[PDB]
Write an enzyme that holds these catalytic residues in place. Sequence first.
Site, PDB file in Angstrom:
ATOM      1  N   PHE A 124       0.850  -1.213   0.000  1.00 57.26           N
ATOM      2  CA  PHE A 124       0.000   0.000   0.000  1.00 57.26           C
ATOM      3  C   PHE A 124       0.878   1.252   0.000  1.00 57.26           C
ATOM      4  O   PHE A 124       1.781   1.368   0.844  1.00 57.26           O
ATOM      5  CB  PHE A 124      -0.923   0.056   1.215  1.00 57.26           C
ATOM      6  CG  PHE A 124      -1.754   1.310   1.252  1.00 57.26           C
ATOM      7  CD1 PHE A 124      -2.605   1.618   0.200  1.00 57.26           C
ATOM      8  CD2 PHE A 124      -1.655   2.202   2.310  1.00 57.26           C
ATOM      9  CE1 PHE A 124      -3.361   2.781   0.217  1.00 57.26           C
ATOM     10  CE2 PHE A 124      -2.413   3.363   2.329  1.00 57.26           C
ATOM     11  CZ  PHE A 124      -3.269   3.647   1.288  1.00 57.26           C
ATOM     12  N   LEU A 125       0.582   2.173  -0.916  1.00 55.82           N
ATOM     13  CA  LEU A 125       1.252   3.490  -1.016  1.00 55.82           C
ATOM     14  C   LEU A 125       0.189   4.592  -1.138  1.00 55.82           C
ATOM     15  O   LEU A 125      -0.554   4.612  -2.143  1.00 55.82           O
ATOM     16  CB  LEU A 125       2.231   3.451  -2.193  1.00 55.82           C
ATOM     17  CG  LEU A 125       3.512   2.664  -1.903  1.00 55.82           C
ATOM     18  CD1 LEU A 125       3.926   1.806  -3.091  1.00 55.82           C
ATOM     19  CD2 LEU A 125       4.643   3.594  -1.496  1.00 55.82           C
ATOM     20  N   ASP A 167      -0.746   8.702  -5.698  1.00 57.89           N
ATOM     21  CA  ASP A 167       0.025   8.856  -6.965  1.00 57.89           C
ATOM     22  C   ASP A 167       0.534  10.302  -7.082  1.00 57.89           C
ATOM     23  O   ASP A 167      -0.019  11.192  -6.406  1.00 57.89           O
ATOM     24  CB  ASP A 167      -0.794   8.413  -8.187  1.00 57.89           C
ATOM     25  CG  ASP A 167      -1.977   9.299  -8.557  1.00 57.89           C
ATOM     26  OD1 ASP A 167      -1.857  10.538  -8.445  1.00 57.89           O
ATOM     27  OD2 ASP A 167      -3.010   8.743  -8.967  1.00 57.89           O
ATOM     28  N   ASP A 188       5.321   3.040 -19.857  1.00 56.89           N
ATOM     29  CA  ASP A 188       4.121   3.835 -19.481  1.00 56.89           C
ATOM     30  C   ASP A 188       4.437   4.620 -18.203  1.00 56.89           C
ATOM     31  O   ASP A 188       3.637   4.549 -17.264  1.00 56.89           O
ATOM     32  CB  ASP A 188       2.877   2.944 -19.348  1.00 56.89           C
ATOM     33  CG  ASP A 188       1.519   3.658 -19.342  1.00 56.89           C
ATOM     34  OD1 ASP A 188       1.440   4.850 -19.759  1.00 56.89           O
ATOM     35  OD2 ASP A 188       0.526   3.010 -18.927  1.00 56.89           O
ATOM     36  N   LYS A 223       4.141   7.787 -16.228  1.00 59.53           N
ATOM     37  CA  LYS A 223       3.356   9.039 -16.058  1.00 59.53           C
ATOM     38  C   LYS A 223       3.090   9.255 -14.571  1.00 59.53           C
ATOM     39  O   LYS A 223       3.205   8.320 -13.784  1.00 59.53           O
ATOM     40  CB  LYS A 223       2.052   8.972 -16.859  1.00 59.53           C
ATOM     41  CG  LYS A 223       1.300   7.654 -16.777  1.00 59.53           C
ATOM     42  CD  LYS A 223      -0.021   7.715 -17.490  1.00 59.53           C
ATOM     43  CE  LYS A 223      -0.762   6.396 -17.484  1.00 59.53           C
ATOM     44  NZ  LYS A 223      -2.068   6.519 -18.172  1.00 59.53           N
ATOM     45  N   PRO A 224       2.714  10.480 -14.139  1.00 61.69           N
ATOM     46  CA  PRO A 224       2.465  10.756 -12.721  1.00 61.69           C
ATOM     47  C   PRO A 224       1.446   9.835 -12.023  1.00 61.69           C
ATOM     48  O   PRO A 224       1.557   9.665 -10.828  1.00 61.69           O
ATOM     49  CB  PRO A 224       1.942  12.198 -12.747  1.00 61.69           C
ATOM     50  CG  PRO A 224       2.576  12.793 -13.976  1.00 61.69           C
ATOM     51  CD  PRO A 224       2.531  11.669 -14.986  1.00 61.69           C
ATOM     52  N   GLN A 225       0.491   9.270 -12.775  1.00 64.51           N
ATOM     53  CA  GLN A 225      -0.564   8.347 -12.268  1.00 64.51           C
ATOM     54  C   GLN A 225       0.031   6.969 -11.918  1.00 64.51           C
ATOM     55  O   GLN A 225      -0.665   6.215 -11.212  1.00 64.51           O
ATOM     56  CB  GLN A 225      -1.689   8.172 -13.300  1.00 64.51           C
ATOM     57  CG  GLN A 225      -2.523   9.425 -13.555  1.00 64.51           C
ATOM     58  CD  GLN A 225      -2.098  10.195 -14.787  1.00 64.51           C
ATOM     59  OE1 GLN A 225      -0.916  10.468 -15.011  1.00 64.51           O
ATOM     60  NE2 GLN A 225      -3.073  10.554 -15.607  1.00 64.51           N
ATOM     61  N   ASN A 226       1.238   6.642 -12.404  1.00 61.70           N
ATOM     62  CA  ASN A 226       1.925   5.334 -12.193  1.00 61.70           C
ATOM     63  C   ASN A 226       3.174   5.484 -11.310  1.00 61.70           C
ATOM     64  O   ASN A 226       3.955   4.513 -11.253  1.00 61.70           O
ATOM     65  CB  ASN A 226       2.328   4.686 -13.522  1.00 61.70           C
ATOM     66  CG  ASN A 226       1.136   4.320 -14.380  1.00 61.70           C
ATOM     67  OD1 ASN A 226       0.019   4.183 -13.875  1.00 61.70           O
ATOM     68  ND2 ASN A 226       1.360   4.175 -15.676  1.00 61.70           N
TER      69      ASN A 226
END
Lengths: 257, 258, 262, 261
Positions: free
Chosen positions: D48-49, D52, D93, D95-98
């Site tokens: 768990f983190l 994003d 891939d 990106k800030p979402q990953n």
Amino acid sequence: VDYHEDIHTYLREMEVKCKPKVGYMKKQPDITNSMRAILVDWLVEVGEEYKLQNETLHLAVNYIDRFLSSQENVLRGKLQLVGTAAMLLASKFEEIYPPEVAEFVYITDDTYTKKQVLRMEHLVLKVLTFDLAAPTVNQFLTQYFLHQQPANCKVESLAMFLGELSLIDADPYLKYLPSVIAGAAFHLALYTVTGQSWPESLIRKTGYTLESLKPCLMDLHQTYLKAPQHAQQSIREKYKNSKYHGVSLLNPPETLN
Amino acid sequence: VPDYHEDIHTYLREMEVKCKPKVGYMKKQPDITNSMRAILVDWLVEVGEEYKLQNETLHLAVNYIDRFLSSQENVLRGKLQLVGTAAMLLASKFEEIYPPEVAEFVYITDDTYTKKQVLRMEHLVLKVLTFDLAAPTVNQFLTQYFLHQQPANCKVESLAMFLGELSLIDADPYLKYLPSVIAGAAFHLALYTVTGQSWPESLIRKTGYTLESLKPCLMDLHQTYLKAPQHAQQSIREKYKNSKYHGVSLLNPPETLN
Amino acid sequence: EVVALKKITEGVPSTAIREISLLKELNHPNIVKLLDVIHTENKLYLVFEFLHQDLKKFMDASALTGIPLPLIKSYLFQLLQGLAFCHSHRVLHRDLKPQNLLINTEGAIKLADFGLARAFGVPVRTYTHEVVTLWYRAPEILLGCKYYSTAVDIWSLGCIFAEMVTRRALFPGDSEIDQLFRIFRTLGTPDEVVWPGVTSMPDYKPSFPKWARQDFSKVVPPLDEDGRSLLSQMLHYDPNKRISAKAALAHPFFQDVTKPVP
Amino acid sequence: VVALKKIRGVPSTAIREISLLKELNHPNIVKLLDVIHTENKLYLVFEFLHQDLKKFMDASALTGIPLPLIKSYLFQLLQGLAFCHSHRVLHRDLKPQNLLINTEGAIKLADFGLARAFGVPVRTYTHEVVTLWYRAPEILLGCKYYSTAVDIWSLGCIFAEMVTRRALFPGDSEIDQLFRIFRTLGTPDEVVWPGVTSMPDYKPSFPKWARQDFSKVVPPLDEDGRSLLSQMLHYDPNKRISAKAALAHPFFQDVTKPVPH
């Protein structure tokens, strides 16, 4: 060239872990090396029909060997279903556009149904535990080629030809690491086309001398000499084509010294 | 009375329709029979008595065995005792304060099975039942019906429990009937034998079952009762001889119901 | 994707068998959701819905101000709804305490940790003695009575209600006999009038001291007449006269209940 | 305990994600704790983190993410990437979402769905892969071969995006993307990128733009920060800086580990 060296170190570490036992077949009671040779021969033909990469075939054979090293009693009637799934898994890992599940049925001539192939897929993945990123002879060859500048395409295709011939004969090739067969295959290709030997740079890279390659080089010289007489012939057929520079038509050398 | 008894009865009546095996599942089971099942359950009764286990624990184990054999195909006769042992271990863990150790369930099978084989069968039974272990039993309905006796008659309770227990032995015909219906028929037949009374009006409103709606099950149970001294399985009749159960299994059954 | 995950020589333990089989029948806005069970030979997982924080960590982070009275009323109304649903489905919880009650950011509270739960009969038999965390344990169990049922859960909720209001545990005992004395000092020493059968129970003794009952205006200063009235009905000595979860929902105390955000 | 959790023949994305991630054990790569497989469901259990980078950036729109924390994050991201490329894995891939962050000051690469193992040398792989904004010019111009350089490009976009708090190159379609890159870095030719005029989706018609000074592109960065960015957004993928060599840039001489809000 700064990742090429770390990747070769990493691949050399993992080819000792992604390993089957040599003497697995004598324990497998209803199967022989003979039957295995016919199945690996068949997957080449499949590879050609759906224009699959050579890496895909090398990966499938690795999965099949490791699966027979683990599972106790494989009935010979199941041996082709194992092969169909192994190749499906390898296509999903390695191909841009993997052939459809319906396509993998079509080539068995409806021997096995869709249900049975998806069921055998699951069983393989459980046995291997998703450890599908196995080093191949192909991956090591591709690294060695960079030490012949500019590339000799005829040497490359003949090395790939000879590496693919090693996949058929469990006895003797199961007791050599991928990196060693690649070394033996590249030196044999290089000597038949140009008269040159396993170069100083690849001795520095691999730490393999030509003495260390000798046992494997002598087994691969014999397979190459009598590849014309072998019961399985799909690979020779494959590499007669202009795509692979017609390298199966070349006469092998009589002696190596 | 507590303001959740009504709710609990309604909820059990809803759930008894769901934990269900098929009538004549045994015909689609080629290596085992109703007779081999009769022998298995009569043995579980003895195991109950040896380890001082609750009647609820025996009723749950039988529920687990019928649902398991309804789902899995080709259960072989050399495994049928191991299914039974695993059902009684799980029911013990669900229902008992002090369940017997795994070592005790190996020991009563006189080392036919290893400890590893009993734990694998426990894993397998739980997978097939999807952890739905909190099943309504005949025992749970009888216990609720007994409160409609005023004052409380423990001799009637004992005969009622004995008749419900006899119904676990015989898949044909008792698979045809819901636990709430078998409890109804058992309670009336015990009442009528010991006391001369009938299925009370307070229970006709509570259950919605008339004496007429209980009649099919009550005629099957009357025959089981008359014929019980001649049955091949005799562990229940021996258990309910004890003074703990007021010697109800020694009572003369009524020759007629009307 | 964000979930809470419970990772479990006698095979599958009785606590897990009871937790899964009971919790998968309980579907209510105020009971934690068991989303899935993952079962293989080697491992067994319970997948629960994610909830922000437990009531114990909220009470500690609120200790300067306390929990606002409206939010205490909201939480008790919701907990009685969840408990009523449990008892309606023949389930005793038997370990209600602030660490087993979970809250989200939107103002909800839910019962959790059904590891020490069990299915009860009508009527009840004798069940495991010495259940419930000491501080929240009812006098029936302490005094070793043959029978206990739904009332033990209402006792625990009463201890939790007072704890939200005063910001300290109501009966913080060190032993069974120290817990009893702490209960007797606040609610008075029980007798045959207020609790018929008390002097017959196995672990009672006539040598116990006799404390007078205390005014609830001293035990719970912040509460009004309606709140004191509800707390005293939840903490009745006789488990036959102790208010039910269902009846408690209709108490005058809840006649202005809202749902504030923590 | 709290976990990130994914459920669902068995898809190629799951075969790649599991097989590759279970070899990648590094503090700046999301830990795959466990994999449970049944004849019905396949479960991937991750550590768990908190949140994003995309959600942290928006929630930091008032002040922008401070520089000491930007330096820390880029330093850790390059350590994770260096590790990936060194075990022959392309993310493809970024990106800030990953990219996922904890409370303690760590950042980690996540979502290895589109990832794959690469040979040395590389073949032609999947025709177009990265999200449009973070996609390298060699993919847009449709070159046979792409490799490690495409991950450094995506990361260079994320670096600028933290500093200026908006997407560097937010284009609508493939030909619009290039025109946004060409405006800032200038139109490439045979000098800076020996190749461009050969490549299949290049045209002679392509319009001209002169190169823009990084003083304007990413104002608040020092000389060293602007130097590193131009070395990560270099056109020729043979001359674009590696994750390894980027760790030795003088921008990082004074790196530390700040705690987020």
